[PDB]
Write a protein that binds this ligand. Structure first.
Ligand SMILES: [Hg+2]
Ligand SMILES: [Zn+2]
Length: 255
């Protein structure tokens, strides 16, 4: 699996049958069909005590890893019951600015989409959480092309170092509070991971308001490699998956 012509999302059902699941992700958010639920509480993001360890190129994206041995960076409130621990965040981008996000707003696609992944901390470890229907919380943030995002420059500058598949680099003192929008208004629904094993373990929380990044910021993204150092160079682009069937499921809005 990859995003190639021969191992793209259209081929994952063969290796991971849940690809054709009942609670698959991403999906199209029909803002006119989303149900305003006044029973939804505000989100609570406690990232002031966050501890970043390193950045890694896994061959399909890059991951910014955080120390989740304790409640340093947590997500609670909203549609969730209990605390969720920030284990990692990564992005999805396109080759061009007209595609890249995984979730769509009224069929509209953004340049990129940031996924902040958290696990339910009544299950003790990530491995355990992915065995539960409410094991994970994906915090979805759309990225659009405009003004530069200061808080993202650190990431962009270190990409050089994790150019290829398997490379990693120390990446401590990185504050995630810098990648958040002003408003916390969100849409929520029961989904899955957007990549293999595609576990139908996730509670999606997609923010209304996108963050803006510069053309030259998103540009360094496109310079990453899928391939391993010393292999024919295949640029890491369009590492996103096409929207799936809602299938009866319903999308709630906090606004
Ligand atoms: Hg699950
Ligand atoms: Zn993702």
């Amino acid at each position: 699996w990859g995003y190639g012509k021969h191992n793209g999302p259209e081929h994952w059902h063969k290796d991971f049958p849940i690809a054709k699941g009942e609670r698959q992700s991403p999906v199209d958010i029909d803002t006119h069909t989303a149900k305003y639920d006044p029973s939804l509480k505000p989100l609570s993001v406690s990232y002031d005590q966050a501890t970043s360890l390193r950045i890694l190129n896994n061959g399909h994206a890059f991951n910014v890893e955080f120390d989740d041995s304790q409640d340093k960076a947590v997500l609670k409130g909203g549609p969730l019951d209990g605390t969720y621990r920030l284990i990692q965040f990564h992005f999805h981008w396109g080759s061009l600015d007209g595609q890249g996000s995984e979730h769509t707003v009224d069929k509209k696609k953004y340049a990129a989409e940031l996924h902040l992944v958290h696990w339910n901390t009544k299950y003790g470890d990530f491995g355990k959480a992915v065995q539960q229907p409410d094991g994970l919380a994906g915090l979805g943030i759309f990225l659009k092309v405009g003004s530069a995002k200061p808080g993202l420059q650190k990431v962009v500058d270190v990409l050089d170092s994790i150019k290829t598949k398997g490379k990693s680099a120390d990446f401590t003192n990185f504050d995630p509070r810098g990648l958040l929008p002003e408003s916390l208004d969100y849409w929520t629904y029961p989904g899955s991971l957007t990549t293999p094993p595609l576990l139908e373990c996730v509670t999606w929380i997609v923010l209304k308001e996108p963050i803006s990044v510069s053309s030259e910021q998103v540009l360094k993204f496109r310079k990453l490699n899928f391939n391993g150092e010393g292999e024919p160079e295949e640029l890491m682009v369009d590492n996103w998956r096409p929207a799936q069937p809602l299938k009866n499921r319903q999308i709630k809005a906090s606004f």
